[PDB]
């Protein structure tokens, strides 16, 4: 019922935070977290 | 606006000129509301109680008791003096005879002036 | 079988000879027909239709034979004919001598004891039935009966304490009330003892009234005949307390019995499905046991009286409180202790013994004994003195906080708004409309109810359609599946203003809207929505569909349940948006989107704050989601209404003379003109009388005496005495001038003395009635008052009033015909021009423009022939002081010379040759060329009069002001329709729109509501009405108002007019008794209805109505038409009724007529049901289609929608074969009786309109010439009554027909060949 990302069963398209619907071929290269910690900046 | 004026002047001199001078202050002033007080006072009452309404809208403050005792001609209109008194001196009292010292009643028009409360107290 | 092999034996009619009445025959048929079936109403149909009450019932009652069944079977035919709408008590006016008997037995049987002797259902029969007597006392038989049941002696039924109260009240009461007990000791001990049951009668059916009720459960199961018993008591109340007569003293009796108290706090009211009906019928009689009349004066109640009446009333309970109780309560100011919070406070804190002790004080109940417990409740106790003592509104105060649209909870409740399925069985919480109304407010507040509530059933049938299309789907979200034409989806809607409230009004002044819609549509559609103007209503739509995506929707189904229908408001277009965000040389939007400001309703906008800040209710208006518009013509509910309550508001200045027959109520005949106090000694008939024969022929009874004795000089004017005598003086026309074209048009029409009758009337200060019959000459008429009021009281103006632009048409084109200058004309409408001339604003404004023109041209000419130099055209103004300097000084200075003497100096010094030299003295006589003079300078004054007059078009520039003028002073004769002058009133008064004398036509098809508001198009004149004379046109016995919804015509009479009550209140009329378009052959099928109407002198002689119509034997026939292939009626869709035997014999008929050379044209085909006119129009197009020798008839239509029309020769299918229905209706019988000059063909199933009583006359007429159509295929000159020089051959079915047609047809199409391309 929801229509938003906010909120199988529902047979909708729903993507519920942010999976992208439409192309982008964005550059960026995924940001990762590595076990418990760190944002892998290097 | 000035031929207004004197129409109004005119239903001043009287039915149709009380028509003219209610239509003048519903127009849409607390003085022009005891003018038109004074018009309930003089032509004419449920009515007159409405527009008295609207003046109570309009102002919540000590002369309405007064409005509402055109109504009475009485105890019913300084019952609602009485109200106004507890919504807010010897208008109520002015309603009791209605119903039926003027310096101890300026000590306390003293009082209802808007160490001084200890003024208000003594 | 059983039932009509019963009549068959015993009663039917049209059977020779019957088996003598039987009384079993009564108990068996009540028993196991009536009884047994549950009291079913197509059991009792078939009784009633079947004539059981006047051939069985009634003329074989007596005292000996009286039981059960015979007084509840006379009952159920009774309340059956008024179910039904026909006659009810005629069989008892003719035979009377028994009723008083049966009448006080019904009386017995109905205060019989609950569940005894008769069931509940049974007494609630004859609570309708009761009901029916009261609401008939116009009927003597019944008032004889009635009388003694609602006299003041029924005061005997009021506590002891209370009667003294009131003889108190109303000292002069008592030597009445003393004159009462005096005769009734006159009186034997059972006279006296019969007197003394029927004065308690309502006071002991009161009693038992409030037992069933008590009887009712608050949550357990209940039987629904209590609920019924209770509602059609409540029924029987207000009906009394509504009619003054019964009023006068029953509503003491009904207040001293606490019945309204026992109702509010009934368990029936408290529950909320089953007590639904009667809370509001509680309602309806709670407004008039308090309503504002007094009840021995019959006077409306002033505001002081009122208010009077209420403080009388907390004073005296303030003395019996402060004498025996309350001590602070009793030395109270009355505003203190009146609200019902105060009265809360004060009187509910005591017991139970306190309250009942209170209330003995006020004479309300009888003493508390000493040390005694009351048996009442104390919230009995408590309500009885709240109640009575609260501070009320006014009637005015609650009708000002209306809203004037419905919303959700109003349009499906089917007890206010029936549907068309109302049978008739239960009642309803309606108004009803007979002869009597209290006041002016009751008889408006009515009117504006039956309207208000029969346009929401319209409503329902426009929402229920349109949001159906739609199809709102489930997507939390909704989707619309579908669309329509009539309602859109709503993009955006927002509240843009809420203004402050007048002072004293609780609501705002104004509340306005923006609502947005996208146009995504067809281009048709796109242009309809953005047709919408201002004033047009429109309604707001909250759905929250319940069905998900794809489900079927069933309009069978509950459609609130279907849509998920939540919230309805109504709004009016102020103006469509452009993009400078102005309100609407109009503009081209562009995009898709459309904002209109609208208006809601401030009294419902208020409720519905007022409802979500106090009990937390969403906020209705930010939840729409549709918008629907509708047909313009079909939408004026709300300004109608509007107007009704502005006319309700105002002071009502109706003529003093009008008031009391309004209300009806008062002498009937007190506003004829012979009892007016104004009527006018002489009047000028001008050119109403042909010769001085004609006029002598036209007065009767009455002796003509002559001013002048040479017949040579024998207009006229006639003086009426103040026995029989009139004095006739024949008088010249003031010449107009040297142009013999300038002599006045005169009317022709031979006006029979009834015609005079109501010329003479019309032309008299009060009301005049005219009864005219089909082709009387009602037009004529009505022209000829019209004019002669025109030349008799030229300051005076007339309004004329219409159903139908068509009658409109038809005034105006004789008017053309009359000497009435065009100047003076003017015709209001919101249309095709049908005249020869343009009588709209825009056509008037015209010919004021043009005719300006030439008449200044013809002051130039003036200026010029008398040497006046000056090259410099002409304006009104200079026209005006030309008049004055140049005109009226040459006039005067030559009437100084001549008239101040002889035949050569008349001419010698005339001023004015050469401008007359276009067109002048005889020298004979010195008075002929004087006045031949004279003539000369009215003509000149003429020119300068108009112009004059036509100043105000060089002062007022917009062809709107200038309309303005025209219709405020120019016009001397304004005309438009009753529906327009329910549109316009506001906008007349605001103009100051005055006028003297009102007509009006077709009045019989007007509703009350729309008659009375033309009587209010002004304001008063010195606190007086203006308005002189009332003149109504129509025929009561024709065709009445068309009321979409029949509910509201079968339980409130709504389509009663005006004119129609009028003639039931006795206002006497004039019947026109000649007609002259028909032949007198045909003139038979329907003037038995009328009195004494025959045929004029035309008719009776010409060639044209005694010429034979070729290849038919008979100018008339019925002809029966069995079944064809095993079918009679049949219906394709539910109550699309058609029968295609009777069609394609009609059809074929149409076709022999064509094929022997008949104008198709001078055919029409009428039917009495819109199934079968389709069906023959299907049949036309699918048998004569692409056929040269066959055209089309003029029209195929209903018989109702061919009122006021006509053509030569008519052919009528009625359809029915199973019951008669709508035809029943006299009225819809003598216009379809009478819609042909020439030729009239019926066909149907004779038996079953035979056996119709009400449809005898008739019948019996059309059933004494063949039933088989009589043709003569080989033929004219064949006058009606010679026997035919060719073959008469018999057709004695519809197959036989179309076979015969079809083998003539080949034979036309093998010998002939026509050529239209």
Known sequence: IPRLLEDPEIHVAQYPLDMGRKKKMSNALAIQVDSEGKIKYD | ?122 | EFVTQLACKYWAPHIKKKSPFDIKVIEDIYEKEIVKSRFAIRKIMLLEFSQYLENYLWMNYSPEVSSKAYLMSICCMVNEKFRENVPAWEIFKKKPDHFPFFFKHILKAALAETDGEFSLHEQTVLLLFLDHCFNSLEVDLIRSQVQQLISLPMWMGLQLARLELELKKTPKLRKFWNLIKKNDEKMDPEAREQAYQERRFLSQLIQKFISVLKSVPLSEPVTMDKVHYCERFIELMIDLEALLPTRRWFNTILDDSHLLVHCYLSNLVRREEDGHLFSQLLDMLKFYTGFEINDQTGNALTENEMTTIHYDRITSLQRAAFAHFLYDFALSNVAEVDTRESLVKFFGPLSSNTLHQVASYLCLLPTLPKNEDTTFDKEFLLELLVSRHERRISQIQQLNQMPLYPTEKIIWDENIVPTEYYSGEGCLALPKLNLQFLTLHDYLLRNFNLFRLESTYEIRQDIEDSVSRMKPWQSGGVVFGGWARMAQPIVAFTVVEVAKPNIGENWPTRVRADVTINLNVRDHIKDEWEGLRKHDVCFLITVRPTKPYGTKFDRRRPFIEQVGLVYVRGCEIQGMLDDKGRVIPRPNLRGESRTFRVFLDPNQYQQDMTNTIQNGAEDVYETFNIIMRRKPKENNFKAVLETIRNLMNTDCVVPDWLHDIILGYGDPSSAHYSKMPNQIATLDFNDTFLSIEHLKASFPGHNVKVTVEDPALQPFRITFPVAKTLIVEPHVIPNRGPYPYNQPKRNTIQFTHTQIEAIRAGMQPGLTMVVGPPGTGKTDVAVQIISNIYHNFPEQRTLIVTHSNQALNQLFEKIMALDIDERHLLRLGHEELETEKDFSRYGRVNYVLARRIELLEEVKRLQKSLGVPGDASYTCETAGYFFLYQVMSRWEEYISKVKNPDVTEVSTFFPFHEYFANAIFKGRSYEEDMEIAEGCFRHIKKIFTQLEEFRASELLRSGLDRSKYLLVKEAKIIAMTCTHAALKRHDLVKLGFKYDNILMEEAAQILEIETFIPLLLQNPQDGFSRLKRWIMIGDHHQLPPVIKNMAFQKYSNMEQSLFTRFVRVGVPTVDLDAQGRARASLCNLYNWRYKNLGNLPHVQLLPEFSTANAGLLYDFQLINVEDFQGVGESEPNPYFYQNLGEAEYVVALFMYMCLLGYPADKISILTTYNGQKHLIRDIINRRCGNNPLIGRPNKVTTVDRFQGQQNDYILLSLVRTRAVGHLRDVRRLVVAMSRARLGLYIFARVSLFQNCFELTPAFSQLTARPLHLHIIPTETTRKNGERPSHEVQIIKNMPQMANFVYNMYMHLIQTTHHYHQ
């Open chain 2, 1 to 122: 606006v000035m031929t207004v004026r004197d129409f109004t002047q005119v239903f001043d001199s009287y039915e149709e000129s009380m028509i003219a001078a209610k239509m003048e202050t519903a127009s849409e002033e607390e003085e022009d509301d005891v003018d038109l007080e004074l018009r309930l006072a003089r032509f004419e009452l449920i009515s007159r109680r409405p527009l008295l309404l609207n003046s109570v809208l309009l102002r919540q403050n000590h002369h309405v008791h007064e409005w509402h005792k055109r109504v009475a001609l009485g105890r019913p209109r300084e019952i609602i003096n009485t109200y106004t008194e507890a919504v807010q001196p010897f208008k109520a009292t002015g309603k009791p005879h209605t119903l039926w010292f003027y310096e101890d009643n300026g000590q306390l028009d003293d009082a209802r002036v808007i160490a001084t409360k200890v003024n208000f107290k003594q």
